[PDB]
Design an enzyme around this catalytic site. Structure first.
Site, PDB file in Angstrom:
ATOM      1  N   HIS A  19       0.835  -1.253   0.000  1.00  0.00           N
ATOM      2  CA  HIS A  19       0.000   0.000   0.000  1.00  0.00           C
ATOM      3  C   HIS A  19       0.847   1.270   0.000  1.00  0.00           C
ATOM      4  O   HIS A  19       0.412   2.294  -0.509  1.00  0.00           O
ATOM      5  CB  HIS A  19      -0.920  -0.002   1.191  1.00  0.00           C
ATOM      6  N   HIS A  44       5.533   7.173   6.354  1.00  0.00           N
ATOM      7  CA  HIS A  44       5.282   6.702   5.004  1.00  0.00           C
ATOM      8  C   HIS A  44       4.773   7.876   4.182  1.00  0.00           C
ATOM      9  O   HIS A  44       4.507   8.954   4.721  1.00  0.00           O
ATOM     10  CB  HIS A  44       4.257   5.550   4.997  1.00  0.00           C
ATOM     11  N   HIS A  92       2.192   9.094   0.596  1.00  0.00           N
ATOM     12  CA  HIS A  92       1.207   8.869  -0.443  1.00  0.00           C
ATOM     13  C   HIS A  92       1.590   9.736  -1.625  1.00  0.00           C
ATOM     14  O   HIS A  92       2.018  10.875  -1.414  1.00  0.00           O
ATOM     15  CB  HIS A  92      -0.215   9.253   0.032  1.00  0.00           C
ATOM     16  N   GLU A 112      -3.182  13.589   0.110  1.00  0.00           N
ATOM     17  CA  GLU A 112      -4.464  13.170   0.688  1.00  0.00           C
ATOM     18  C   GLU A 112      -5.216  14.419   1.153  1.00  0.00           C
ATOM     19  O   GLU A 112      -6.300  14.741   0.662  1.00  0.00           O
ATOM     20  CB  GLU A 112      -4.195  12.160   1.819  1.00  0.00           C
ATOM     21  N   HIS A 135       3.499  11.234   6.036  1.00  0.00           N
ATOM     22  CA  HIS A 135       2.832  11.041   7.322  1.00  0.00           C
ATOM     23  C   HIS A 135       3.807  10.455   8.323  1.00  0.00           C
ATOM     24  O   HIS A 135       4.291   9.318   8.128  1.00  0.00           O
ATOM     25  CB  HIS A 135       1.648  10.072   7.168  1.00  0.00           C
ATOM     26  N   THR A 158      -6.096   7.078   7.240  1.00  0.00           N
ATOM     27  CA  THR A 158      -6.540   7.247   5.857  1.00  0.00           C
ATOM     28  C   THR A 158      -6.509   5.956   5.072  1.00  0.00           C
ATOM     29  O   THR A 158      -6.828   5.974   3.873  1.00  0.00           O
ATOM     30  CB  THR A 158      -5.787   8.329   5.132  1.00  0.00           C
TER      31      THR A 158
HETATM   32 ZN    ZN Z   1      -0.689   7.954   5.448  1.00  0.00          ZN
END
Ligand code: ZN
Length: 257
Positions: free
Chosen positions: A61, A91, A93, A103, A116, A195
């Site tokens: 992910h 991590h 996104h 996000e 994050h 999230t």
């Molecule tokens: Zn995140």
């Protein structure tokens, strides 16, 4: 089997995780014209001098840079928070294109990516206990734009070939997360959620206003990661972001005038 593909993406998550349609979901759009300065907020305290990174993992992910959280080595305090929150992992996104990937959004603007830094409230003893509490986590969110390179990110970029596919990990010691911070710690804060599934409503979000810059070459290397496992059909790990969710009965507060 949740993910970010053509048939299992965010719009489907509610079937297995009904809180996806809850009252305190994240991310959200940050409207800079309605967020209000809150003079009761305190400066963020980010104490990462003693941080012990251990390992980097492709979990299918994203990838997580994991830290030793068995002592108060890398803590977040102050700001909106009561007590002490331990860094467990960070991590990102990111998008397939530089015009998307974050996000949170700011006046509907999407950034190329979002970092994050995830911390859990030491009052609850372990991460798994913390995520069951409304004030269990504090996540520090940092936007990424494409421009200059971020030197402090390069060691992450350079290990990604070793964790191309889901389930791969690599030793990753002595990484300094201070090299991922912008100059200013001015922030917005609001109550929300993880999230990703399980989407638990356990987070105090602290989103920095100032983005960091990464180079186009750095983001290109993120986009070479894979969602799939080794020996499976290649699916590039891109567009691993959840879109903004309804703010509902929440207010976003600003640390700065
Ligand atoms: Zn995140």
């Amino acid at each position: 089997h949740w993910g970010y593909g053509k048939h299992n993406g965010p719009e489907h998550w509610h079937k297995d995780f009904p809180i996806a349609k809850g009252e305190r979901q994240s991310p959200v759009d940050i409207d800079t014209h309605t967020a209000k300065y809150d003079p009761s907020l305190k400066p963020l305290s980010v104490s990462y001098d003693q941080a012990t990174s251990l390992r980097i993992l492709n979990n299918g992910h994203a990838f997580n840079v994991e830290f030793d959280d068995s002592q108060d080595k890398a803590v977040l305090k102050g700001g909106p928070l009561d007590g002490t929150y331990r860094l467990i992992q960070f991590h990102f996104h990111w998008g397939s294109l530089d015009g998307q990937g974050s996000e949170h959004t700011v006046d509907k603007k999407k950034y190329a990516a979002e970092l994050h830094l995830v911390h859990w409230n030491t009052k609850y003893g372990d991460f798994g206990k913390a995520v069951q509490q409304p004030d269990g986590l504090a996540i520090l969110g940092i936007f990424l734009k494409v421009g200059s390179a971020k030197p402090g990110l390069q060691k992450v970029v350079d290990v990604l070939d070793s964790i191309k596919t889901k389930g791969k990990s690599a030793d990753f010691t002595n990484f300094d997360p201070r090299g991922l911070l912008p100059e200013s710690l001015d922030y917005w804060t609001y109550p929300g959620s993880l999230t990703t599934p399980p989407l638990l409503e356990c987070v105090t979000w602290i989103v920095l206003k100032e983005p960091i810059s990464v180079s186009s070459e750095q983001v290109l290397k993120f986009r070479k990661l894979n969602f799939n496992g080794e020996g499976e059909p290649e699916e590039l790990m891109v567009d691993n972001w959840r879109p903004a969710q309804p703010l509902k009965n929440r207010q976003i507060k600003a640390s700065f005038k």
